[PDB]
Design an enzyme around this catalytic site. Structure first.
Site, PDB file in Angstrom:
ATOM      1  N   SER B  10       0.945  -1.009  -0.055  1.00  0.00           N
ATOM      2  CA  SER B  10      -0.130   0.068   0.158  1.00  0.00           C
ATOM      3  C   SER B  10       1.024   1.260  -0.067  1.00  0.00           C
ATOM      4  O   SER B  10       0.774   1.890  -0.829  1.00  0.00           O
ATOM      5  CB  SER B  10      -0.882   0.057   1.125  1.00  0.00           C
ATOM      6  OG  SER B  10      -1.694  -1.179   1.138  1.00  0.00           O
ATOM      7  N   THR B  11       1.557   1.468   0.838  1.00  0.00           N
ATOM      8  CA  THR B  11       2.693   2.754   1.077  1.00  0.00           C
ATOM      9  C   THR B  11       3.974   2.014   1.148  1.00  0.00           C
ATOM     10  O   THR B  11       4.989   2.539   0.626  1.00  0.00           O
ATOM     11  CB  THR B  11       2.280   3.371   2.183  1.00  0.00           C
ATOM     12  OG1 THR B  11       2.015   2.866   3.540  1.00  0.00           O
ATOM     13  CG2 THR B  11       0.950   4.363   1.688  1.00  0.00           C
TER      14      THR B  11
END
Lengths: 180, 177
Positions: B10-11
């Site tokens: 995701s990040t």
DNA sequence: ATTGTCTGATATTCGATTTAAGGTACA
DNA sequence: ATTGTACCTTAAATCGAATATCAGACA
């Protein structure tokens, strides 16, 4: 080696007959079948009855648990007990050869999609560890008190009584700092 | 016969490189590795889609790292097995090829069509992990008192809760009805 | 002196994992 | 009756997202 069978619907009665019709046509006695509607009670009854080695037949997967997760849950619960399940329309068994092949996999799936919710969390962790945040429990014992006493020649079992901690702890604490 | 790999987060960069480093240790050349991060920027997974050829094989660290959900994940695999493209997950020890490789795709086709059929059940009428603080307050108690004409502040002092909570409890039961 | 409404701060709660300490076993 | 040493159990504590309660402000 009794033969049981299960069906479920949300609303419809008619589809509840087709399932039961398929299941009797599978050589399932009438008194060996359980059902549910919109009240999971019959399933629970089935949880009760089953003994190790018994086998349960279901039309399709979608007729088992309320969702993809619950469905797996129940099967796992049943292969816990040495029960086996066999789905008719899709042709699948938790026993025999593929028996292990099957539940190896439905495990990973659940635990996968579980891991996907936490995707954000457990990642925010990796980054935290990177940063050097300390993990695990916090040190509740003074590592200086202990190292000093053992420098003077005081022994393990006593230091154990003195500070009211375990002994094996004190062989651990010394191992750590004598390593570093 | 080629070997490719895919990685998705995701990040975090770190949890990505963990996957890359594990895909290079699994013997995937550096240029044969694609990535994504969250908009739906699937660009990596698409570029891959293009380059594979029949017989080539893709490595992914864990199942969770393929689709955005259980469907996307299965949908993609059928699509690869259609091309004679094989997918292998390291840490879970699962492959769409070799011996049990069919028995693998065969069942995955069952759940999609099982849960496709569950999606159709909900739709006509209308996460599974519980989260967050437990209700320490009895709602039945607050409902009956205010139902009897007991003011907001009288109940709050009675049950040692805050007043503002009293209104939350009311607003929740009202939208439900 | 309370009443509605709303916003912000606290306080838990999860799953898989990572360390700290307790506890047994053996020579 | 203590000493090392090796493992196995617990016991906290990790992240961010999610849910509930608390504590006030304002009109």
């Amino acid at each position: 080696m009794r033969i049981f069978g299960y069906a479920r619907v949300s609303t419809s009665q008619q589809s509840l007959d087709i399932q039961i019709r398929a299941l009797k046509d599978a050589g399932v006695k009438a008194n060996r079948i359980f059902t549910d509607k919109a009240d999971r009670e019959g399933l629970d009854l089935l949880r009760m009855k089953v003994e190790e080695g018994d086998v349960i037949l279901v039309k399709k997967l979608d007729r088992l648990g309320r969702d993809t997760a619950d469905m797996i849950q129940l099967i796992k619960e049943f292969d816990a007990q040495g029960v086996a399940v066999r789905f008719i329309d899709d042709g699948i068994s938790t026993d025999g050869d593929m028996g292990q092949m099957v539940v190896t996999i439905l495990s990973a799936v659940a635990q996968a999609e579980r891991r996907r919710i936490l995707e954000r969390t457990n990642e925010g962790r990796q980054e935290a560890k990177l940063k050097g945040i300390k993990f695990g429990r916090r040190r509740t014992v003074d590592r200086n008190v202990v190292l000093t006493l053992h420098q003077k020649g005081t022994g393990a079992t006593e230091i154990a009584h003195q500070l009211s901690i375990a002994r094996s702890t004190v062989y651990k604490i010394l191992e750590d700092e004598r390593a570093s």
